[PDB]
Amino acid sequence: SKTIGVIVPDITNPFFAQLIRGIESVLYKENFILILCNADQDVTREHEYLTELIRRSVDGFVIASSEISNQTINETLRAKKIPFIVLDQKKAEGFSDAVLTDDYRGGQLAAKHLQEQRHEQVIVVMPPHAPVNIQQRLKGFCSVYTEKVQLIETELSKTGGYQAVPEILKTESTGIFAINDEIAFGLYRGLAEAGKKIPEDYSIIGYDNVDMCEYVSPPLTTIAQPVFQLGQTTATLLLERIHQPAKDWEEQTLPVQLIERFSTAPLK
Amino acid sequence: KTIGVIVPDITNPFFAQLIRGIESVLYKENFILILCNADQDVTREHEYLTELIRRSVDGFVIASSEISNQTINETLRAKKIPFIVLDQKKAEGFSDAVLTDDYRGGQLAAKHLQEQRHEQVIVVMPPHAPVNIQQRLKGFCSVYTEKVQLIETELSKTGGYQAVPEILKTESTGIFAINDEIAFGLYRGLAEAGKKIPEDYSIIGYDNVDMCEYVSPPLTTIAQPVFQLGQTTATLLLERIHQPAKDWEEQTLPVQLIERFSTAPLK
Ligand SMILES: OC[C@H]1O[C@H](O)[C@H](O)[C@@H]1O
Ligand SMILES: OC[C@H]1O[C@H](O)[C@H](O)[C@@H]1O
């Protein structure tokens, strides 16, 4: 059949849309078709569609969502010898292929940047019970930042960043690390409604470098993930297992970098 | 149970939300959704689209003009695989189709700029546009019957950005961006040139994607009911599946103006 199942958290976040293009770009060349499963549109309580999809007889699965459990994977895919690869919000056990990006180092770079701009009181805005990759950004951030950090939990979404703004306005913080660019966009909107300026009132740094970063005002300083390349590499490694099932388990980490734009400024 | 869905590209939030609408129906009925981003088949012969359209599925959703009627007739009709067309794929009589009112949308954008007192306006849009998009221009020009300039550019954020130098050379005051992505491009470019919205240019977009609420100023635009377009499309297809003799059904959905803060009366 030459079918690959792709399970992502959503397709509305430009991050996961570009992941899919990355994958599609590799699959097209080999006449594989992409079965799309974004978990957000499975509205059942116990992910009935996901559990039924993971049991289809496809040639391989890309798993980027933590909603597929290690137990499920063992009883369906390892038991049936259906190759798969994990990334992003799906944590690797270590007996599979996986492609990570360097979340820990990204958090370090974000911290280093706010320190270079002399911010001493900062907020990190992130979801509760965060996926491990996301948690690593906070961990990397706190590995090098030794001044006052406050955590605000909010939904991993534009509405989430928006709904965090009232709490931020009650604090003494001057710099904000938004754990993804969508949160940062939410911040922008909420801060604008409050008549607060960026970066004059708040310095903000995002994460991902989605295309919209250059179209918001001011352009958003962020940590770039190589998402197109993550999608290409992920598909490439999966098709390699499909063609030689017994190859060794491979786990690569792709690098990240700071993209400085106009959304931070030195504390004056 | 499989449905092939052919869209121009999923990186446009419009198409992401369409797919979400489709999925709200398909997932509950346990269908598999095969995605094809038509944009990414850059082969001379569109060999991937041919490969895909020849697959044995239960049905196709076709929102791309890159699948010709000939290809459909010879492949889908001849094999009795049901399908439905929408958006950039023009409907004929002998197929199901869900439209949105592109002509009226264009008229609504024009009426808004007219109410906002703009006399010299520009429309920013792609060359050889899909028919549904072309209709927006037709609608808009039904109202602005003179003093409309057309700037042709790619249907994307970078396209809108690229168009700003040409805009700056005109005396226009109001701009209709044929989609929100082009409008976001205009924002970036006009910021770079030191121009303000709406103080120097009033801008109206098209689609009402999520991001309209998060740009500065929030973008006035023509909303397409895109989730519901997704739902209705998937419903009509499954209806044809369980009743293949069904008369063809061709249902145009409504649009409307969402007024935010990217236009102002010309002073
Ligand atoms: O922006 C979406 C986030 O959730 C995912 O885990 C990605 O890494 C990305 O940062
Ligand atoms: O926004 C992408 C555009 O191309 C498509 O034709 C849609 O209708 C939308 O307006």
**Closest chain A C-alpha to B34 CA, distance in angstroms:** 5
Amino acid making up residue B20:
R
* Residue B71 and residue B152 share a domain: no
**From the CA of B234, how far away is ligand 2's center (Å)?**
18
Crossing angle for the helix pair A132-144 and A103-116, nearest 10 degrees? 40
Nearest to B260 by CA among B221, B214, B207, B202: B221
Q: How was this structure obtained?
A: X-ray
Query: What is the C-alpha R_g of chain B?
Result: 19
Residue A200: which region, alpha, beta or left (left: phi > 0; alpha: psi -120 to 50)? alpha
CA distance B178 to B221: 10
> What is the domain count for chain B?
2
Among A11, A13, A90, A230, which residue has the most ligand 1 atoms within 8 Å of its CB, making it the best to mutate? A13
| Whether residue A248 sits in one domain with residue A214 | no
With CA atoms as reference, the chain B residue closest to A215 would be B188
Same domain membership, residue B237 and residue B121: no
- Looking at CA atoms only, how far is residue B23 from chain A in angstroms? 7
Tell me how crowded residue B230 is: count the other CB atoms within 10 A of its CB: 26
Strand partners, A175: A122, A203
Residues A219 and A170 in one domain: yes
Contact assessment for residue A126 and residue A179, using Cβ atoms and an 8 Å cutoff: yes
Are A219 and A37 in contact by the 8 Å Cβ rule? The answer is: no
**Gapped junctions in chain A, after residues (C–N > 2.5 Å):** none
What six digits make up the tokens of B42? 């850059």
Identify whether residues A93 and A169 lie together within a single domain.
no
Say whether both B189 and B214 belong to one domain: yes
Alpha helices, DSSP H, located in chain B: 13-26, 47-53, 69-71, 78-79, 102-115, 131-143, 157-168, 180-192, 226-242
Q: Are B75 and B53 in contact (CB under 8 A)?
A: yes
User: Which atom of ligand 2 is least distant from the CA of B209?
Assistant: 1
Q: Is there a single domain that holds both residue B52 and residue B151? A: no
Among B250, B256, B235, smallest CA distance to B108 is for: B256
Q: Tell me how far apart the alpha carbons of residues B207 and B56 are, in angstroms, rounded to a whole number.
A: 33
Domain span at residue B93 reads: 1-101+224-255
Cited resolution, angstroms: 1.8
Same domain, A214 and A183: yes
CATH number at residue A10: 3.40.50.2300
**Number of neighbours of residue B69 by Cβ within 10 angstroms:** 14
Scored b (16 or more CB within 10 A) or e, A90-118 reads bbbeeebbbbbbbbbbbbbbbbebbbebe
Q: How many angstroms separate the CA atoms of B192 and B179, rounded?
A: 21
Radius of gyration of chain A (CA): 19
Q: How far apart are CA A103 and CA A87, in angstroms?
A: 12
Strand bridging mode A251-254 / A203-208: unpaired
